[PDB]
């Protein structure tokens, strides 16, 4: 996260850190708890991941230093990538992780509400991007979860900022015209959380941008509301 500040423990209890154990253990991506055996994240996170056996999901983490060999994690039973996904820049950058065991909800770990089809029309004014990613292009993963409040940008405005890309309505952009606050390397897969009528909603999934926090280069997020039926298809399968 660029231009952010340290989060407080329990502030973003749906935020997870997804680690890979291959070749050595390291933070891979962010993610969000959306159900008691479900993590919503970005499809591009699994580039080169041949098995869910190398994945570890850590919930209830403020600081990466809380993670040692003896720290409890959730194993991943299955990786579900959207069928139409090719690359982050073309959209469909969405994936589900089916956990091997269920998450026990509490004040440290709980789900974020998915947006409603009725909320497709609402204007969100209190949106925050969170993660342990870099604070600039050449940096390192941050120990403490960071947060940055960023305004949503219309599709029309985001399309003029990304000449040469096709910014679809399945994408949602966020950033200040002057830049300064954004997601960066290591934040992808994590949430763009917006508070509406005192309820937090998972509006976006951190996907891509041209550099980090650059002027007139909004961060591009998977527009979660456009995938509610897809998530329900996968999580509510008979």
């Amino acid at each position: 996260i660029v231009g952010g500040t340290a989060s407080v423990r329990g502030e973003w209890p749906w935020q997870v850190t997804l680690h890979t154990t291959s070749p050595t253990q390291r933070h891979l991506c962010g993610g969000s708890i959306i159900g008691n055996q479900w993590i919503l994240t970005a499809a591009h996170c699994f580039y080169g991941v041949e098995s869910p056996k190398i994945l570890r999901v850590y919930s209830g983490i403020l600081n990466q230093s809380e993670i040692k060999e003896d720290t409890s994690f959730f194993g991943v039973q299955e990786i579900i990538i959207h069928d139409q996904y090719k690359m982050a820049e073309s959209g469909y950058d969405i994936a589900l992780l089916k956990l091997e065991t269920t998450v026990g909800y509490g004040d440290s770990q709980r789900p974020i509400c998915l947006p409603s089809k009725g909320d497709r029309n609402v204007i969100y004014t209190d949106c925050w991007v969170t993660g342990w990613g870099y604070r600039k292009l050449r940096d390192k993963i941050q120990n403490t979860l960071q947060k940055a409040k960023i305004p949503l940008v219309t599709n029309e405005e985001c399309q003029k900022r990304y000449r040469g890309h096709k910014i679809t309505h399945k994408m949602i952009c966020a950033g200040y015209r002057e830049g300064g606050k954004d997601a960066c390397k290591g934040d992808s897969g994590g949430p763009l959380s917006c508070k509406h009528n005192e309820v937090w909603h998972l509006v976006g999934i951190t996907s891509w941008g041209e550099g980090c926090a650059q002027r007139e280069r909004p961060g591009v997020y998977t527009n979660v509301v456009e995938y509610v039926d897809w998530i329900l298809e996968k999580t509510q399968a008979v």
């Binding site: 959306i34 159900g35 008691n36 509400c113 998915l114 947006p115 009725g118 909320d119 309820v199 329900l232």
Partner: peptide
């Protein structure tokens, strides 16, 4: 939530 998992 309105949407239930």
């Amino acid at each position: 939530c309105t949407t239930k998992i």
